[PDB]
């Protein structure tokens, strides 16, 4: 519910204008069986300098769910993100590729999730919110003992509707006694079984009676359908779907800036190749590519990656296994290899042991590339964006990745001293191109029967296609079991055109 993220107030001026003061907003998220509410409240200090206000609160909500998905235990990473507000679905589906297997959808079925701020606790705490922070509370806190998650959802929804309608008869119902208190550690009044059932009657009759006295309706002659509807609301293909937005991520870059070793090389790349490469990659399908570049005249501390080489391979979640036979190419005949690079679904600030291992095992399988002068560029898919970094293995990481046979997640012999940084720069002055395999294209993603790192294949001075290209998925595209002579049936082929 991003209904509360946008808030203002109106007051009369000495000019005669209704002067607008922005107020604390909050984007709310609910989970029924967890009884869980998480409201990310930003104080009015947010919209001081931003011209746009409504779409701004919307984008803030989408980015907020994005960073919350980045911070929340992956064990709780949900499959779907349902949105009361339609405009969330767009920026959410833009930013939540950071949970790319989390689909975004809007609800035609609306919930009184914002008007549940008609409780003094949450509303007051929202207006008293002194800084930006997401807080959580337990709504059905007491129910789950001898009640169901489903019934807790239905009851919270109905009572929320009744509170959004009047909240005065709702306070009458919710404090009908002076001795019956509510648990303060809980959200709702802890009532007995028959007490909660009677409160269900109160809230349901409230919804029905207010509905009828509003709509001049014979609300007793309404069915259970109208009653239920009114009370509770209004009366790899995943990759083929998500990966098509790879062009929107390109225009959002982050280049890891940190302490400068200030002795080694610094890698400067033109960003158009990185855009096109994240476009020929996907959100989870990681692409691998060997970089090629030049050092500028009289500028030995700079290594500008001015060309991309894509060799026959495929990419998985955490690793990428590329051709052991490396690229020979005339277009890079005056060039040098500066190492490797991979797109990444997962975001952490540590150079992959598997990647650095392939790198050291390539610098030891070919001494032409210099180990300390080899670097691996990881392009991580952050909330609706790409963040790029380039790290390099010293002799320590080199030994680790060279003799390291088991490429597990945290193997025997990983270390925080293993990898080292180099500084990278995006540049808008010079552009290169890419070179890809000859007899097939780079991508064998859907084809594992034709995969080998020793594979014999040339490189070609040409551009690539997207990951899901009609070529590099030969499986489904040739899937055709057809009865031909059906075309004689229904022989009305009226054309009249050409």
């Amino acid at each position: 519910d991003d209904t509360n993220v946008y808030r203002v107030t109106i007051h009369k001026t000495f000019e005669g204008n209704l002067t607008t003061k922005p107020i604390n907003g909050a984007i709310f998220i609910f989970n029924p069986r967890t009884g869980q509410l998480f409201l990310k409240i930003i104080h009015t200090s947010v919209w001081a300098g931003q011209k746009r206000l409504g779409q701004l609160a919307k984008w803030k909500t989408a980015e907020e769910v994005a960073a919350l998905i980045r911070s929340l235990p992956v064990e709780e990473q949900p499959k779907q993100i349902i949105v009361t507000r339609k405009g969330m679905l767009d920026p959410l589906e833009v930013h939540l590729l950071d949970f790319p297997n989390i689909v975004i959808k809007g609800s035609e079925l609306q919930l009184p999730f914002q008007a549940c701020l008609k409780v003094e606790k949450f509303g007051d705490l929202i207006l008293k919110a002194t800084e930006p922070q997401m807080v959580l509370f337990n709504l059905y806190d007491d129910w789950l003992k001898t009640i169901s998650s489903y019934t807790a959802f239905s009851r919270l929804i109905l009572i929320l509707r009744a509170l959004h309608v009047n909240n005065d008869r709702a306070k009458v119902i919710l404090k009908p006694d002076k001795t019956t208190i509510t648990e303060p550690h809980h959200i709702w009044p802890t009532l007995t079984d028959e007490e909660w059932i009677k409160v269900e009657v109160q809230l349901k009759d409230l919804i029905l009676a207010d509905y009828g006295k509003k709509n001049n309706v014979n609300v007793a002659s309404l069915t259970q359908s109208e009653i239920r509807d009114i009370i509770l609301g209004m009366e790899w293909r995943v990759r083929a779907i998500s990966a098509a937005n790879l062009h929107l991520r390109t225009n959002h870059i982050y280049v890891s800036s940190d302490d400068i070793k200030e002795t080694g090389y610094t890698y400067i790349l033109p960003k158009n190749v990185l855009k096109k490469f994240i476009c020929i990659s996907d959100l989870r399908a990681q692409i691998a590519g060997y970089l090629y570049g030049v050092s500028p005249p009289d500028n030995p501390q700079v290594k500008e990656i001015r060309c991309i080489v894509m060799v026959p391979q495929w990419g998985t979640h955490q690793t990428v296994h590329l051709p052991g036979q490396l690229p020979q190419h005339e277009y890079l005949k005056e060039m040098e290899p500066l190492g490797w690079i991979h797109t990444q679904p997962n975001e952490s600030p540590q150079l992959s042991p598997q990647d650095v291992t392939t790198h050291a095992k390539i610098m030891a399988d070919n001494p032409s590339w210099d180990g300390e002068k080899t670097i691996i560029i990881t392009c991580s898919f952050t909330p609706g964006s790409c963040t790029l970094t380039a790290y390099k293995l010293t002799p320590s990481g080199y030994e680790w990745g060279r003799q390291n046979t088991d490429k597990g997640n945290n193997p025997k012999g990983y270390l925080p001293s293993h990898y080292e940084r180099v500084q990278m720069l995006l540049s808008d002055r010079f552009l290169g191109f890419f070179m890809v395999p000859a007899q097939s294209s780079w991508n064998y993603n859907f084809m594992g029967v034709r995969h080998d790192p020793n594979m014999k294949y040339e490189l070609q001075l040409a551009n690539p296609k997207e990951f899901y290209h009609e070529v590099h998925r030969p499986s489904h595209f040739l899937n055709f079991a057809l009865l031909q002579e059906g075309e004689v049936y229904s022989a009305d082929r009226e054309d009249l055109y050409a």
Binding site: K276, L431, V449
Partner: protein, 1525 residues
């Protein structure tokens, strides 16, 4: 008063073909009405025919025109209607209108009007060869049109005349229809052909229109017929060329008004008839169902049909009309169940047990169709649904009267001519996806279904039982009698009419819009009864001439298409402006609101999921819906698609998308509803995707164009490119395609295998042979390419493409169409595009196309050139353009500043005798002139002067010439122009400038070497040509008249870039060489246009930084505004055809008060263009506007006229300037155009060099030219066309100039790249060195290898080398790279020269001349010619062999052979004395051989070849003497 818009929704007809416009009906003769339960049944008996009048005899084929009777065999007795019509049908080109019952025989009336139109072109010694005649025959239906074409082919082949049917794509089959006679087609066929332009390339020779069954005007299809009629009438009144208009329709009212709209005379051109002359008089019955529930109606229909079945179960024929797909077999078994449950009643359709061939009907048991259970009984079901030959096997025994009950669909009435006794038609409706659901069937459809009851041979009078509604039976009985009035649906497609005619250009302004909207059949309709057309009588009388109605109606279409970007103009102008998107939509027949949606949805990031969804949301099918009854199976339909539409939900968008994908996969969707939706959607899908593709490709989204080419191929072939390639060639089975598809074996490695290995992938040598032949039929284009750097950001790419698969003329057919697209570094957007259309002639040969592509700041590692066919599946060839080592040329310093000094008067130079021929001409010298004056007069330095043609370069040379004359009286000066026409023209100025005024004799170089040596030495001023001034004076050492030249001038010094400029370049080099050697200071004055490399030109030709002055073409005496005007078709024919409107329009728009020179590519194009401009100005009633004078003022100059074309063209004020007219005729035309009587001049492209008459407006139209050397088009020369653009300026009057470069899409881009920017000068010394090197080696100035190096140290390549070494492909610009380049170049040159037997190379350093070398040096012939002569001329040869040897010379192939000339010289060499062995007339060797044979035979030739033979003989003499030596 401004026009007032009307709400264009309601004033038109809803649900066409069912209108029932009349408010009452009329009873027939014996109509009887019986009111029964559940249905009211009305019956009307057969008619009594109109009695033949007294003294009336029918017509056989004997007393008819003799040439007409051919092909009418077997037909001795015609129908009386055709008999009475044939007199005027054979004797009159009047517009004819027929209204007669279906089956009356008007078909043969139109057939006879076509046979007589064929006889209109005939010969004594030649047959009906149709190079003079063509026709357009618009028949209503596809099956009937196909049937008529198939029959009239054989019937009409009697003379050998071919009737073709119109299905062919635009450019694939166009020259085949050009190889066709009368074209049979549909209204939409003709409409799409006209919006594509297909009608005007055939027009002026297609003098007949044959419209059959025009009654669909009342149906919604009426818009196409009305567009045809309106455009026909309007264009005919503009062209004044006649055309026969023959329409045939059923018997109904409004035929007089339709004839009026057709411009048909009711006096002698009317043929009207009722239902009384019918072939078999029809007794009709309408069973109207008033039942409230269709649940009752549906079985009531079965019961009433059972009654109508047991009625004619006697000796009779029932033809059952069923409306649904499987309804053919579904109406079956209902009669069977009635007959079976009737207790052995209803059956027994024969005369006994043994009779009527029941054993035959049983023994015909096996058919792939449902004949199994239907043939043993007499009632059967027939359709194209079941099979192909089973329809034939049903119709055979039907004609044998062995099937007295046959259930079929309206495709039967659309099918071949087969008769029937009685009809029983159930339903009266169809399922139309154009409006979205069930609709009353077509009027023409019901007339068709009632057109097959009753035979001419066995059946006497026919009947019919139609089960329809009691409410719609009023319309249905007023249809079966002459009571339905034929109205129009014009206002519906009036928007598409406006868009199409505005793209077509016959209607630009609101005036032409009203003139066109008055051309509709709707115009006569509103004129005679606006009643149902949208006006009350008071305002109707208040606007009687429909002026106000044409002011209102047009406005609505104009504004709607204006908002939807098919038009753009405010209420201010009224003149229309169609753009690329409107063009794509109008040409590819997608809706204009769908085109708006497509323009708004089209984005660079369009994925497949979004592209197919945008195609499904097209406004073409706003009537398609997603019913639940099929939405259950719709789940599966979404499940079987590989590309997910999942953003789309269960509704018409996703249903259309998943129908697209299910069809593409060839997936079976159970429901007939979804089936029909698929039919219509995928029928218009090709068109929609084609429009979107053209749009996004022209917009430049390369990724969108790739997605759209994938979609286009997949929608053409109804398949996926991920499937085996040979699935597009019908030859190899699905089993074989799947056998190749089972395992992982890319196509791209299927070629390198052997014939056995190609099948050994699946282990089947049985296929290896045919699979191999298929792989050799698999299309491939092969690409080589070169890159040449001209400018820093601007480069050129020259590609050669050869077909790498031998074509199959049954599959490849006429030609191969593809796109070659130049793309940037990462290939996201396209840089440029050339659409390749290669005919059957040019397969397997390299295709050499030259186009320019730029670069930008971030120098890229590689660009792309992608050549992929239009229709092919999985066939493409990309070509890298590697720029990693690319270094473009130096950015040239900017131009010299235009400083302001006083306009120098002509008395500035203190000489009055020099001011005399200057002052009286121009009062003030140009800024460039007054700036140059100081350095050009008061100094003795060498000048390089850049100013574009028209800034006074002649004065820049003349000041220095007068300066040399002032320096000394007897000083010498030689000016050189490599353009012979320019040299002669400037000599024409200098003759009066010098000989009379200054007395300094002027001499212009000539071919005769002795005569030219003598010419010099008498005159102090010598104008010259490049070859005449180089060949002579290359050895000038002894001729003392050369070294004394104190002044040398050179006109058009930028010309180095083109071929044959090496002569003048070596000449200026040697000029400076002699200037150093003679010990005298020798001045040079070079005048050329603006060039970036002017600095290097000056530094080489002996000028310093301040003493150089180069100005850009933007500093001009009268500044010129130039524009690029595109016609987006690739065919040069289509471009030249559709460019005529812009030329006349530009005459009227930019310079209606100024003269217009229209430059066209060809000489004969000049007469034709004058004719076209005259036919465009004559319709514009203000005609004869290109003359400013009276009638009789021309007669004294027209008395000497030779071509009747030129006389009349000048009479209308146009006039043409070309070779074929006499020189005095050129003088007369030049006088007229320069004096202002003829406001227009049509000039051939070659005349832009020798144009001695100035002008105000220039229109350089169709900048291509069809060079026969490659037998293909090529760009006009850059500097030539630049001078052509300079040729439109009148310094005396005009303050600015107007130049219109009409060029194609790809050929206007090079204009934008080369015209507004100046052009540098290039050096081809690397290519043309050996000739002059040999001449000088003989002349003993080049004495060794190092001496040839010294020679290299002087030329133009020496300059441009480190300036742009990418031009001569020099891998280096440093000292050692330049040294090695010069060294190796001179080395290889002298080596080839010594191998040619021309020189002797001793010690590898020294070199000297020999016999052949001296021969060449003396005779001024090319080394190749000398080598061929030395190697061919032998002991026993004769005149014949030496003729061919000298004809194949180098300097003998420069003459070209023009278009379609391989026949003239062929028939000439048929009787030429010395025959040849396997020669092609496209080789200038055999061409010069033919010229030699003709000149030796003294037979007069046509001027086009006479000029050529003259040019040959004028040069052959030196070669002759050298060969004798």
């Amino acid at each position: 008063a401004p026009r007032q818009v009307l709400d264009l929704e309601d004033l038109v007809f809803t649900q066409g073909s069912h209108f029932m416009a009349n408010k009452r009906c009329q009873l027939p003769d014996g109509s009887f009405r019986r009111q029964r339960k559940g249905y009211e049944e009305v019956h009307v008996p057969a008619l009594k025919p109109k009695p033949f009048g007294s003294e009336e005899q029918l017509l056989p084929v004997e007393k008819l025109p003799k040439y007409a009777q051919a092909g009418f065999e077997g037909f001795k007795t015609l129908n009386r209607i055709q008999s009475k019509l044939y007199r005027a049908a054979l004797e009159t080109d009047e517009n004819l209108l027929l209204c007669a019952p279906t089956g009356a025989g008007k078909t043969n009336v139109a057939l006879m009007c076509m046979l007589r139109e064929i006889g209109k072109h005939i010969n004594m010694d030649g047959t009906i060869n149709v190079d003079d005649f063509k026709i357009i025959y618009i028949a209503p239906m596809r099956s009937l049109v196909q049937e008529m074409v198939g029959s009239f082919g054989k019937r009409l082949a009697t003379y050998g005349i071919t009737v073709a049917e119109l299905t062919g794509d635009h450019q694939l089959c166009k020259e085949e229809i050009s190889a066709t006679q009368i074209i049979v087609c549909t209204p939409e066929k003709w409409d799409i052909i006209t919006r594509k332009g297909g009608e005007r390339t055939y027009t002026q020779l297609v003098r007949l229109i044959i419209l059959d069954e025009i009654h669909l005007l009342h149906d919604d299809r009426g818009p196409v017929l009305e567009a045809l009629v309106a455009r026909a009438i309007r264009n005919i009144e503009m062209t004044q060329e006649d055309v026969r208009l023959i329409g045939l329709s059923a018997t109904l009212p409004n035929y007089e008004d339709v004839a009026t709209f057709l411009r048909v005379d009711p006096a002698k051109g009317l043929f009207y008839f009722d239902n009384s002359f019918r072939p078999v008089p029809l007794e009709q019955t309408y069973v109207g169902i008033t039942e409230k529930k269709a649940i009752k109606r549906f079985q009531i229909m079965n019961e009433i049909v059972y009654e109508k079945i047991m009625e004619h179960a006697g000796k009779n024929q029932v033809l059952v009309f069923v409306h649904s797909r499987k309804e053919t077999g579904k109406t079956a078994r209902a009669i069977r169940d009635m007959c079976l449950e009737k207790d052995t009643l209803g059956l027994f359709l024969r005369e006994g047990s043994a009779s009527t061939e029941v054993l035959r009907t049983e023994a015909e048991q096996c058919k792939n169709l449902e004949l199994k259970d239907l043939l043993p009984y007499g009632f059967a079901i027939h359709h194209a649904g079941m099979t192909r030959v089973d329809r034939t096997l049903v119709e055979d025994l039907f004609a044998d009267k062995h099937i007295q009950v046959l259930v079929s669909t309206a495709t039967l009435a659309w099918g071949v001519n087969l008769p029937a006794h009685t009809v029983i038609i159930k339903g009266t409706q169809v399922y139309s996806p154009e409006k979205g659901r069930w609709t009353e069937l077509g009027a023409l459809d019901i007339l068709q279904m009632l057109g097959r009851a009753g035979r001419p041979q066995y059946d006497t009078k026919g009947e019919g039982i139609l089960i329809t509604s009691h409410g719609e039976l009023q319309y249905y009985l007023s249809l079966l009698n002459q009571q339905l009035p034929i109205e129009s649906q014009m206002v519906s497609k009036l928007p598409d009419m406006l868009n199409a005619e505005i793209v077509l250009g016959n209607v630009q302004n609101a005036k032409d819009a009203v003139n066109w909207l008055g051309y509709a059949y709707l115009y006569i309709r509103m004129l005679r009864s606006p009643t149902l057309y949208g006006i009350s009588h008071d305002d109707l009388k208040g606007d009687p001439l429909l002026d106000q109605r044409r002011l209102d109606l047009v406005h609505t279409a104009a504004l709607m298409l204006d908002k939807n970007n098919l038009v753009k103009y405010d209420k201010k102008t009224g003149n229309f402006q169609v753009t690329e998107l409107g063009r794509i939509a109008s040409h590819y027949y997608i809706t204009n609101d769908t085109v708006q949606t497509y323009n708004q949805l089209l984005k660079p990031t369009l994925s497949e999921i979004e592209l197919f969804r945008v195609f499904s949301l097209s406004s073409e099918f706003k009537n398609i819906t997603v019913r639940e009854e099929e939405k259950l199976e719709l789940q599966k339909l979404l499940e079987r698609v590989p590309i997910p539409v999942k953003e789309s939900i269960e509704e018409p968008s996703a249903k259309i998308n998943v129908l697209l994908q299910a069809f593409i996969s060839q997936l079976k969707l159970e429901g007939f509803a979804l089936m029909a939706d698929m039919v219509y959607v995928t029928q218009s899908a090709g068109r929609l995707m084609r429009a979107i593709f053209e749009i996004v490709l022209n917009r430049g989204w390369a990724q969108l164009t790739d997605k759209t080419l994938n979609l286009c191929k997949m929608i053409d072939k109804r398949m996926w490119q991920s499937m085996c390639p040979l699935r597009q060639f019908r030859k190899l089975p699905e089993e074989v395609v799947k056998k190749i598809e089972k395992k992982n074996f890319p196509f791209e490695r299927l070629y390198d295998l052997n014939h056995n290995e190609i099948g050994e992938l699946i282990r089947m040598p049985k296929m290896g042979k045919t699979i191999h032949k298929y792989v050799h039929l698999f299309p491939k284009l092969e690409l080589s390419v070169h890159l040449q750097p001209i400018t820093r950001s601007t480069l050129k790419v020259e590609l050669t493409i050869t077909p790498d698969f031998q074509w199959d003329e049954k599959v490849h057919g006429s030609s191969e169409a593809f796109w070659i697209l130049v793309e940037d570094v990462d290939s996201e957007v396209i840089l440029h595009h050339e659409y390749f259309l290669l005919k059957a002639k040019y397969a397997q040969d390299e295709h050499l196309i030259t186009f320019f592509v730029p670069v930008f700041e971030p120098l890229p590692p590689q660009y792309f050139i992608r050549v992929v066919s239009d229709r092919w599946l999985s066939c493409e060839t990309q070509l890298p353009v590697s720029f990693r080592h690319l270094i473009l040329p130096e950015k040239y310093p900017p131009p010299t500043e235009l400083l302001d000094l006083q306009p120098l008067p002509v008395s500035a130079l203190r000489n009055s005798a020099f001011e005399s021929l200057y002052q009286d001409k121009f009062p003030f010298f140009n800024p460039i002139q007054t700036q140059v004056f100081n350095t050009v007069y008061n100094s003795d330095d060498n000048v390089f002067v850049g100013a574009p043609t028209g800034s006074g370069k002649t004065i820049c040379a003349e000041f220095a010439i007068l300066r040399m004359l002032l320096q000394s009286s007897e000083g010498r000066c030689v000016y050189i122009t490599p353009m012979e026409a320019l040299a002669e023209q400037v000599y024409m100025d200098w003759y009066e400038k010098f000989q009379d005024r200054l007395n300094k004799k002027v001499v212009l170089l000539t071919g005769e070497t002795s005569t030219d040596l003598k010419l010099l030495g008498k005159g102090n001023i010598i104008i010259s040509t490049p070859e005449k001034w180089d060949i002579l004076s290359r050895r000038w050492k002894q001729r003392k008249n050369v070294q004394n030249i104190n002044l040398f001038v050179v006109d058009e010094v930028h010309l180095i870039g083109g071929e044959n400029g090496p002569v003048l370049e070596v000449i200026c080099s040697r000029m400076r060489y002699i200037s150093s050697q003679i010990e005298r200071p020798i001045r040079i004055v070079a005048l050329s246009s603006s060039l970036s490399n002017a600095k290097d030109v000056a530094h080489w030709l002996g000028c310093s930084a301040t003493s150089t002055f180069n100005f850009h073409p933007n500093v001009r005496p009268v500044p010129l505004e130039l524009h690029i005007q595109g016609f987006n078709i690739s065919h040069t024919q289509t471009r030249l055809l559709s460019m005529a409107k812009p030329v006349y329009h530009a005459i009227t728009k930019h310079s209606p008060k100024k003269p217009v020179i229209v430059f066209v590519p060809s000489r004969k194009q000049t007469r034709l263009t004058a004719i076209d401009i005259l036919t465009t100005c004559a319709a514009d009633i203000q005609r004869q506007r290109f003359l400013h004078c009276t009638e009789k003022d021309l007669i004294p100059y027209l008395e000497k006229l030779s071509d009747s074309t030129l006389k009349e063209t000048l009479l209308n004020g146009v006039g043409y300037l070309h070779e074929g007219l006499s020189p005095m005729e050129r003088r007369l035309v030049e006088q007229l155009f320069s004096s202002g009587a003829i406001q227009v001049v049509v000039a051939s492209r070659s005349l832009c060099w020798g144009m001695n008459v100035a002008a105000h407006l220039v229109i350089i139209m169709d900048t291509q030219y069809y060079n026969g050397k490659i037998h293909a088009y090529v760009d006009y020369p850059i500097y030539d066309v630049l001078q052509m653009v300079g040729h439109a300026n009148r310094p005396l009057q005009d303050d600015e100039g107007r130049c219109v470069i009409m060029c194609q899409g790809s050929k206007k881009d090079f204009f934008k790249k080369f015209l507004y920017e100046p052009l540098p000068v290039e050096s081809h010394l690397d290519h043309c060195m050996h000739d002059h090197f040999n001449a000088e080696i003989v002349t003993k100035t080049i004495e060794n290898k190092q001496d040839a190096v010294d020679y290299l140290t002087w030329t133009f390549l020496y300059r441009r080398m480190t300036q742009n070494p990418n031009y001569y492909n020099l891998q280096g610009i440093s000292h050692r790279h330049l040294s090695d380049h010069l060294s190796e170049l001179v080395e290889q040159t002298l080596s080839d020269l010594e191998q040619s037997k021309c020189i002797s190379i001793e010690d590898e350093m020294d070199v000297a001349p020999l016999n052949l070398g001296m021969i060449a040096a003396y005779y001024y012939i090319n080394y190749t010619t000398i080598e061929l002569f030395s190697m061919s001329l032998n002991a026993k040869t004769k005149v014949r062999g030496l003729i061919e040897i000298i004809s194949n010379a180098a300097e003998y192939e420069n003459i070209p052979i023009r278009h379609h000339e391989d026949n003239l010289l062929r028939q000439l060499a048929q009787k030429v004395p010395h025959k040849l062995n396997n020669p092609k007339f496209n080789d200038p060797h055999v061409k010069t051989n033919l010229l030699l044979q003709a000149h030796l035979s003294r037979m007069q030739l046509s001027a086009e070849l006479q000029s050529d033979t003259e040019e040959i003989l004028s040069k052959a003499i030196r070669l002759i003497q050298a060969c004798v030596d």
